[PDB]
């Protein structure tokens, strides 16, 4: 019955595609994490310019709201999607709820790392909500990975 | 139709289109960093003005650029021509930024040097023309990667 299944594979991939776009947006916050207190050098490495991180986290925030806006535009995965959409709302929330240390002239490095740097030894100002958001997008990626693998398996199962 | 062999055309096409959508999302994230140029996080959630402190924001954009290049390096018959065209575009984006360190790599990178690097509609290039071009290669690599997947699905007839 290749008629039905043709659609089913498109639909499932469409979701997996949408999910990876959000998993990649989030990974860009991990690259932003490598940029706290850094400028560009001629050789292409990163050199230190300490404790000016206001617009770095501003863009980190900007991305974290794109993530929510992307999740919203998403069968069967309702629970794992809404659980992820709630996670990204509490990442934006915790960032915006910390302006007094993330929203000033000369945002320091220390409180910058506390917001977008995973495994930061000192999670206080948003990282925990980001780590929890990374795990939440894994369970959803795997769910939509398996969801599409199931529609391909329908091809061959007698 | 060779039903087991038609899959693993779909699977492999899927995998590439995924990894291709990955680098688009990283591209699209740079546009989010272009909205942050000379901005700060406010209480109500909006972006309030804080000009001329932009060094770290462009270092963030720069690392995304070398992740884009690395991703395209880990990436295919009809795409080998389009993969290398995209990868090459992403290295001239990473090279126009470092070649401009004195403007984009100093304490107090001004709002207007940043809008010539990652902002697409500026009046241009510190990096933007290589960005707009990189975004061009990817959009045609994605078209190719999409057509590869549609051709595999099509083989089921």
């Amino acid at each position, epitope marked *: 019955n290749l008629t039905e299944i043709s659609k089913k594979i498109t639909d499932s991939n469409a979701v997996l595609l949408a999910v990876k776009e959000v998993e990649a947006l989030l990974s860009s916050i991990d690259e932003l994490a490598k940029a706290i207190g850094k400028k560009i050098k001629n050789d292409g490495s990163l050199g230190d310019e300490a404790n000016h991180n206001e617009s770095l986290l501003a863009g980190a925030y900007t991305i974290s709201t794109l993530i929510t806006q992307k999740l919203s535009k998403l069968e069967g995965l309702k629970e794992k999607i809404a659980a992820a959409k709630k996670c990204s709302e509490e990442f934006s929330t915790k960032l915006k709820d910390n302006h007094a240390q993330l929203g000033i002239q000369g945002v320091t490095d220390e409180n910058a790392k506390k917001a977008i740097l995973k495994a930061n030894a000192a999670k206080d100002k948003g990282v925990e909500e980001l780590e929890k958001l990374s795990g939440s997008l894994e369970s959803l990626s795997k769910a939509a990975k398996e969801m599409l693998a199931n529609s391909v398996k329908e091809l061959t199962s007698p | 139709p060779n039903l087991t062999e038609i899959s693993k055309k779909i699977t492999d096409s899927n995998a590439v289109l995924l990894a291709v959508k990955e680098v688009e999302a990283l591209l699209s994230s740079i546009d989010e960093l272009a909205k942050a140029i000379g901005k700060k996080i406010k209480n109500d959630g909006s972006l309030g003005d804080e000009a001329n402190h932009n060094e770290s924001l462009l270092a963030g954009a720069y690392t995304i650029s070398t992740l884009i290049t690395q991703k395209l390096s880990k990436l295919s018959e009809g795409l080998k021509e389009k993969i290398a065209a995209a990868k090459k575009c992403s290295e001239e984006f990473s090279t126009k930024l470092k070649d401009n360190h004195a403007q984009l790599g100093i304490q107090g990178v001004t709002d207007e040097n940043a809008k010539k690097a990652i902002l697409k509609a500026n009046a241009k290039d510190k990096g933007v023309e290589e960005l707009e071009k990189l975004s061009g290669s990817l959009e045609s690599l994605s078209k*190719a990667a999409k057509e590869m997947l549609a051709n595999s699905v*099509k083989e089921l*007839t």
Partner: antibody
Amino acid sequence: QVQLQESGPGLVKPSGTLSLTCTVSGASISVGNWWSWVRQPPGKGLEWIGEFYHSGKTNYNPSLKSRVTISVDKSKNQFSLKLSSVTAADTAVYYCARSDLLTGYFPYYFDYWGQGTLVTVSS
Amino acid sequence: IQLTQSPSFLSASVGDRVTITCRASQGISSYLAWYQQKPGKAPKLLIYAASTLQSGVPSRFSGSGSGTEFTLTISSLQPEDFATYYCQRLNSYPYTFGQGTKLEIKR
């Protein structure tokens, strides 16, 4: 802008070979898309002849397979239609056409057409 | 495999609502397209995926369908819609066209 132009003789004698060429501007047939021929006898409806992809894959209408061939000039950005052993039933307006995924992922839909050329079969 | 368009001909005044049906002999999912054709011109794609407008085709057109029954509707007919209309099945080749429907403007 994507444009398609059909060229070829408008008159063929029975049992002879029909030839037509489609000149594509605004789009490279080597880069992507499915390219196709479609036919419409005057007064009747539309019938799809065949299609090719730059990968080399080619599909033909079963009702015409024995006598249809489609060739591609990657260097001229053109493709051709060859129809052997034509009778008066093959008299039609002939169109070349492009297929695009459009806003989706599958299948391809016909979004660009040429102006069409009338080919009549008579003696 | 087989595609039947319900009305072969239809007279309708300007303003009227039109309904045109297409019937597939097997499931073709949502893989269907609608075209308008004015005399001496190439088919113009109005609707694809059986409910999606092409960019620029007016709101007055709309299509709905899945699983062998498809319908194209024109609300508030205009003079600019005297045309034959064709569905098209695009799930497999050949991409069978509907037999057509001429849209006369009645008197």
